[model samples]
Target: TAIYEVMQVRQGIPLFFEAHLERFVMSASLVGTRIPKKEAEILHNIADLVEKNKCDHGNVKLVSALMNEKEIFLAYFIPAEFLDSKARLEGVHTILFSGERICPNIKTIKGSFREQVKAVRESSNAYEALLVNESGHITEGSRSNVFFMGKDNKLYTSPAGSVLKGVTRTHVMQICSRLGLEVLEKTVHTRNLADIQGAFITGTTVDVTPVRSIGNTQLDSPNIPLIRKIVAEYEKKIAGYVSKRL
Candidate 1:
């Protein structure tokens, strides 16, 4: 089994480092592979790697895998794909794909899923793809989580366990609370796409990127004020976290 966590770095500091490490430890435990290092030691390792790589503003992926009874492999590196302002403003296109993750809780790598989703995304000319489970419910995006802004001005997302509990997703929910926005953790069906007014995908890379469309469904423009507000608040939160670390 494999477990991994991706974290955003800013100015030599890792944002939400503690939260990310805790989640990474939890994910490893869920798969019966306990992280051999303590939280403090992991933090030290991350800081050392950031200095070694001289990464100021980018993303880092920490991967842990057990090959045999006593061997564990740990690796970290800056990812190639980073978020940009252009992609955030002019939201990327997403398509709906039919599939569900095997262990949605564990952040494990699935070669088949990666291949299939990539193929569909390329063929459909979409930047991302959402997974529709057997019951026709939208579980999550291929590499992110889904949130729909309904006509009622409420945010709807997949119920817990239906999708990966993303760090960015949790922070978005917190932002919604701070802004007095109603968030419903329910199953968002692809069949009800027409009812959705606005939508977005959240992850370590794309923090709060609005969705332009899903498959043939054309959603409301990504320039919604509420989504933009949430994005701003999320950025503030990032600044706060980074400052404390520095």
Candidate 2:
């Protein structure tokens, strides 16, 4: 299987550049894939890709694939767009898809999920499709992580060892400390959705976005106090992140 990683670029800067690189190495190693280049080499390649493309903002994807006993590495920009103000304020819809990827902890090439997720998302007009595993636990999003604010007023998410270690997800885990909130990485079961008070999704393109609804369940997540707090803190981090690099 080919492994990959995506880093969000803003103002020609790769957001969480170091975090993504570390995760990139983790993902490649977990799948027995080798990233032949050093971290500095990959960094220069991305810098060149961004500089040459004149891409001020978007996502950059790096892929390390093995074919016929040879490894091929690739780096390029992918289309990037943030959730609009309307969606950011009102939250967006999501559908529950009953499927999970093999080797869920790694970021590898899975060509089938994109079309499947897109079809289901557009059919329901939802922004993301929450993956439901065979254990009935709600895993991370197809391309994101799901965080639920529990009834106990704490944050909940899939266990750290179970899901893909999303770069934004890990960043928010640190942000939780600043907000005086505790994050419990536990199983968020689909059947026990009532235990969760509100929820949001995070990813490379979308920061901390409120999920207003999942499947037919309404979340009213936009105004959740913790969501607002986390989003605000996350924005400040984003500002500091981009400004410092600039």
Candidate 3:
């Protein structure tokens, strides 16, 4: 199934549950797959599973797969690992590949290049894969969203419709605005890497993590003070969001 959400459960509460649900429903709609259970019902199921497994802080993946054309299979479980302090602070190495998603809006399992990406990442000793479109523009990461801090002190990323609208990505953008950082939705060219002073990637697992390098070009992750500020603000944002919802 292409419709799924990887939610981070912190102290038995799902972080950004509403936002994730909103995006999940949008994905289901975009793919024309109807959910068999009500939204509330599914949420309850997730809650139950979390309690049953005693998952206080971990990665839980909620999946919806269509079976027999009408049956929607819904499941939830925790994954073993996510980003920790080691990877977050030191940053992750990423390699660039020339490819793009078929449908950038919907988060579907279909037409995925996970294996291909994993292969490249492993062979190159990289932590993530950043995809560059055919037009010579960097789009997004294979499992995360890419952001580049330009020499102008502005954050540049793929415009809307060019990549998946990730939950963390939205929060990061909001954090940027709150911190008085200018965020511009523009195409990041691979050849213009030198123009980017620093870069980072965001997702459910890797929350606003700095990128050490893109291919062989070492980025300014180690010296980027703004990246640390963004990470801090995002952590505060998560606490605020969870407290308000709960």
Top TM-score model: 2
**Per-residue lDDT of 98-195 in model 2, one digit per residue for the tens?**
88887777787872255678888878988888888888999888888999987777788898777888888988988987667888888889876887
Supply candidate 1's per-residue lDDT for 186.
91
lDDT of 1 by residue, 54-107 (tens): 757777787777776553747577554665778777887899889989888767
**What is the TM-score of each predicted model, taking all chains together?**
0.91, 0.93, 0.91
Error of 1 at 66 (Å): 2.2
Best by lDDT: 2
Among all windows of 10 consecutive residues in model 2, the one with the lowest summed lDDT is 107-116
Off by over 4 Å in 2: none
Task: Between candidates 1 and 3, name the one with more favorable TM-score.
Answer: 1
**Candidate 2 vs 3: which has more lDDT:** 2
Q: Report the number of clashing residue pairs per model.
A: 0, 0, 2
lDDT-based ranking: 2, 1, 3
Q: Rate the local accuracy (lDDT) of all candidates.
A: 0.81, 0.84, 0.80
Better of 1 and 3 by lDDT: 1
